[PDB]
Amino acid sequence: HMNPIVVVHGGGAGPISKDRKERVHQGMVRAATVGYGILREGGSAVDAVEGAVVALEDDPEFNAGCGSVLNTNGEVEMDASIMDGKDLSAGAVSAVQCIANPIKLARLVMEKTPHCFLTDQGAAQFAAAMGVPEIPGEKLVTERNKKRLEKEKHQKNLGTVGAVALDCKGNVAYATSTGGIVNKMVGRVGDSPCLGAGGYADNDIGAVSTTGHGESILKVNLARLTLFHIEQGKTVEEAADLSLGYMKSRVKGLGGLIVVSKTGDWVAKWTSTSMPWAAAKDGKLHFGIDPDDTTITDLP
Amino acid sequence: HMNPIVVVHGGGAGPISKDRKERVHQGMVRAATVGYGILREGGSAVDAVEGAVVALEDDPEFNAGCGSVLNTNGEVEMDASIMDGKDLSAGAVSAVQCIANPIKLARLVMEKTPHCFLTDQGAAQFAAAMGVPEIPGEKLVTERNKKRLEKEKHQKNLGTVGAVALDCKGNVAYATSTGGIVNKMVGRVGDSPCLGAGGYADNDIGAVSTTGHGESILKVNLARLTLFHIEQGKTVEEAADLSLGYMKSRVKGLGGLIVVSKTGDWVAKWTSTSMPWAAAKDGKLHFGIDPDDTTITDLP
Ligand code: NA
Ligand code: NA
């Protein structure tokens, strides 16, 4: 059997201000510690990624669930996806409204339906039938983001989130969740709910979770493109640098990903300014935002 | 400069009824003629695939626009996408109702919003805002689709449609459009609006559009997969062989596809029992529905 791993990430974009840098650091750690925990105790790769992204979703500091950015109407519209590499089972939702955790509902889609992807009205109807509580719009909206929008009509890092794991039985997974872009049109769907773009998981290769400007990530299929390079004989760092290499040069898009290979090698790389990220393996925690600021602490 | 080619497909699925052959034939014949009619005037690939798909949306013989299957709730919700192979530009709509031409909506996403993907109520909102006609819903509903929904409510060939083309400037483009699968959950999204799944187009490789089990085409990112093999030097036939057989072995999915390379080489291939298709090249027009049984006649 294999040593478990969990990698998680925040926004793949601009510099984080001194202010929020302690909260960001804290949130990635809580996120990865939840993930590793499920993995410490024998749990699944999917439960570990569902786990970590749920913590981040609830944390107002991350651009997912509560604290998601506003659309043009000043409304929170969220998307998310999950996938299990064993047989490639997958779940996604776009432009979901009035719920704390889209990733959980994406996981509901994956095991409680014949489908892989529900949107808007129908995804709302499937939430209800499943018993997901409706919370008012204002439980999701923050004064930070309330400002962000009003000042966008007339350098940032929002906090798109994701997670990849490997469990003790050699199974991989990913989850990604986002509140989208600031001032996005109504019903704009980015890369997070789209298999192969927002993320991909395959037992025979590895798992990726991406962040950045969705539109580019979607155009280049960033997640599947990374894994195509791994099959091609490249290392996790090599593949990342190449896949991220194309996105900058072909579509002028920057950002970041995280990867775990089927064999336990892991990396976090970015062409944007910064990506918050944490990694938990072998009783230590790995963390970082700016290039080469990486710290290691032993985990309990 | 290159010789232009367009390829069209309906759905790669069950046995076509005999009282339905000529009618699908005339449909495939129309759509392929219309597309090559556009290329022959020095039209762009993006122009050609759009007009070809429009012809199939307007045709009640097929599951896209007029002739879409009904969901679990008696209504029409449609998916469409389209991609320019030159700058990797793209537009796509999912879960739209009460418009005539979802593909025409997909191009307005490409051409007139800084986004790639729109959905459901936000797609209908944008459409009303670009003067797309908001038509009566039952006019997209045919007698037959009411009958299939009751049969299921108390395997088959549901002709989901698409086109690829290489123009006289060397550009490639795909378009795909659908109502999806009968009795579907409200707000279901399939492969057809998703990039790298229902299609992909890239001037450095070529273009592909797909048909079959939509969750299955998604899980395996079929179209972009097809292109990966053509990236390794495999003919377009071996590549379509490798990607269709892989979706088969891994996720148990049957499907089909058309593909044209940057050299102007092309094939229509499938693993389901039938898949009506047609292609235009060198003033000649090819049509088929089954393997072994192809016809080649002059297109004056
Ligand atoms: Na949050
Ligand atoms: Na039609």
Curated annotation (Swiss-Prot), chains A, B:
GO terms for cellular component: cytoplasm; cytosol; nucleus; photoreceptor inner segment. It comes from the Eukaryota. Changing residue 160 to S: Strongly reduced enzyme activity. It catalyses: L-asparagine + H2O = L-aspartate + NH4(+); Cleavage of a beta-linked Asp residue from the N-terminus of a polypeptide. Substrate binds at residues 188-191, 211-214. One of its GO terms (biological process) is proteolysis. Heterodimer of an alpha and beta chain produced by autocleavage. This heterodimer may then dimerize in turn, giving rise to a heterotetramer. This is Isoaspartyl peptidase/L-asparaginase. The lineage of its organism: Eukaryota, Metazoa, Chordata, Craniata, Vertebrata. The gene is ASRGL1.
